[PDB]
Design a protein around this ligand. Structure first.
Ligand SMILES: N[C@@H]1c2ccccc2CC12CCN(c1nc3ncc(Sc4cccnc4C(F)(F)F)nc3[nH]1)CC2
Length: 504
């Protein structure tokens, strides 16, 4: 869990935490009470607290007077490992040394607050499986807690059971009636996750996973949207709770950090994970490194795969077409304009209609453009220079109407677009991964990919099937940093899936 992130504290509270429990170099992060997307990094230095604003407008986290990042945990990791980079306006170095840990259990996935033993039994009996657990406040003994764990065989009939374990709070510390006394509920839970309790007759109280509360029956998505809309809101809690799981996803991005690739990244610290990056072959032996593009393979796991990538730079257009060729991709989804709010988001990597251009070893002909309301389709022919028999059609679906701020007011445009993309891809035997990009290749790109993954479950299984939006996003975020950036995008995913279901 992301311990240095304190949900539901004020600025004044943050200052006092850092002044009373911190030292110089201690820091924490916190969200705005009013605004999803606004965050503050609070840092103790020279016996005082400095607050630094962070904003997410949908494409990345933007640290004021600092750099752009895919996640707050990648931001924190960066400044803890690169001394001198975070600076005050007058030049003075702001050091992030010591994460100040949140002791408040409220945001933990396993924490259920005021919840009865009867209610906890019902939740575990209906939704739980072997090793599902939760912690709740004791009704009998104020300040105490109860750990409730389901154990059994998952293949009803007494083969499973719920066990309740009392957690005492004695003199500011937590225990289970013996052994170690913990400074927080979190420390206690983490210890008994690693070191399971055993009953008198041998049952191991395995804390395998927090009770799942977010999985739904897809046909009931409207009721879940209603529930998540209740007022801050359910949607915000859910997206934040998911965000608290991002420290499990700090996978190496060593290749993207190499000096030989520094000019190949649109944003210096938004990098592909090494374990999923697209590796480019047959490269120019004269180039110091020719195997790198800022792109990751996204494979759903619980047929069709994706390449999530950034908007091309002038110097990466040739690499982009090498990738498209190598991976046998026949469909590109572009979800940005070239220029938005005065800023270039993607260089034009395609020729004008009816024109032919060479891009290094590759050539692309733009055969025909077809303009719909929300998108333009460009029928491109890609081939290797010298080898006409390598020609294949690449269909570029360019979504034009995504708003400059926030998300579209309805999902119909995105749904229609994604339906055309899906059918084109499905019609081409042996097509490779669908290439998807925006500007940084994480916010909108993540949103379109996750929508597509969830819709495809419904295509296969019908509307009577389980879907789990945050679970799916965590799986995609394990393959490219920070996929799905904002709460507005998260709500839009639910909106798109709901309206897919409603138009069957
Ligand atoms: N602590 C909360 C509280 C406070 C006072 C009173 C009651 C309650 C319940 C409480 C916890 C349980 N609820 C909850 N919401 C969530 N949203 C996203 C996620 S992430 C997820 C989901 C599914 C699978 N895999 C992941 C992964 F970890 F891999 F990302 N998990 C969630 N769990 C509802 C909110």
């Amino acid at each position: 869990s992301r311990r240095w992130f304190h949900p539901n504290i004020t600025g004044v509270e943050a200052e006092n935490l850092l002044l009373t429990r911190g030292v110089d170099g201690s820091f924490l992060a916190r969200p705005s009470k009013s605004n999803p997307g606004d965050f503050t990094l609070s840092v103790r230095r020279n016996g005082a607290v400095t607050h630094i604003k962070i904003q997410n407008t949908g494409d990345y986290y933007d640290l004021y007077g600092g750099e752009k990042f895919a996640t707050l945990a990648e931001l924190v990791q960066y400044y803890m490992e690169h001394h001198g980079q975070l600076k005050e306006k007058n030049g003075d170095v702001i050091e992030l040394k010591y994460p100040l840990n949140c002791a408040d259990p409220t945001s933990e996935r396993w924490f259920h607050g005021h919840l009865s033993g009867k209610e906890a039994e019902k939740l575990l009996t209906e939704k739980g499986k072997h090793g599902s657990f939760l912690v709740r406040e004791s009704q009998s003994h104020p300040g105490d807690f109860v750990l409730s764990v389901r154990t059994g065989d998952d293949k009803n009939d007494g083969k499973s059971k719920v066990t309740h374990v009392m957690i005492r709070c004695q003199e500011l510390k937590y225990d289970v009636g013996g052994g170690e006394r913990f400074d927080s509920l979190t420390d206690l839970v983490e210890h008994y996750k690693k070191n399971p309790m055993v009953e008198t007759l041998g049952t191991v109280l395995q804390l395998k996973q927090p009770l799942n509360t977010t999985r739904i029956n897809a046909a009931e998505i409207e009721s879940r949207v209603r529930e998540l809309s209740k007022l801050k809101q359910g949607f915000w809690e859910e997206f934040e709770t998911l965000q608290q799981q991002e420290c499990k996803l700090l996978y190496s991005r060593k290749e993207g950090q190499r000096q030989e690739n520094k000019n190949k990244n649109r944003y210096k610290n938004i990098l592909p994970f090494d374990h999923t990056r697209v590796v480019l072959h047959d490269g120019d032996p004269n180039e110091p490194v020719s195997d790198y593009i800022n792109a990751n393979i996204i494979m759903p796991e619980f047929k069709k795969s994706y390449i999530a990538t950034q908007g091309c730079l002038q110097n990466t257009v040739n690499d982009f077409w090498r990738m498209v060729f190598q991976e046998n991709s026949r469909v590109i989804v572009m979800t940005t304009k070239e220029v938005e709010r005065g800023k270039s988001k993607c260089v034009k990597y395609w020729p004008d209609e009816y024109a032919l251009k060479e891009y290094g070893v590759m050539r692309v002909r733009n055969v025909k453009e077809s303009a719909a309301h929300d998108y333009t389709l460009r029928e491109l022919k890609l081939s290797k220079v010298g080898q006409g028999n390598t020609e294949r059609t690449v269909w570029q679906y360019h979504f034009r109407t995504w708003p400059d701020h926030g998300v579209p007011s309805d999902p119909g445009g995105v749904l229609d677009f994604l339906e055309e993309v899906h059918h084109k891809q499905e019609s081409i035997m042996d097509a490779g991964p669908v290439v998807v990009h925006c500007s940084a290749g994480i916010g909108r790109t993540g949103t379109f990919i996750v929508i597509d993954i969830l819709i495809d479950i419904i295509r296969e299984k019908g509307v009577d099937c389980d879907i789990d939006v945050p679970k799916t996003i965590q799986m995609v975020r394990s393959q490219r940093s920070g996929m799905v950036q904002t709460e507005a995008q998260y709500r839009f995913i639910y909106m798109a899936v709901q309206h897919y279901i409603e138009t069957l």
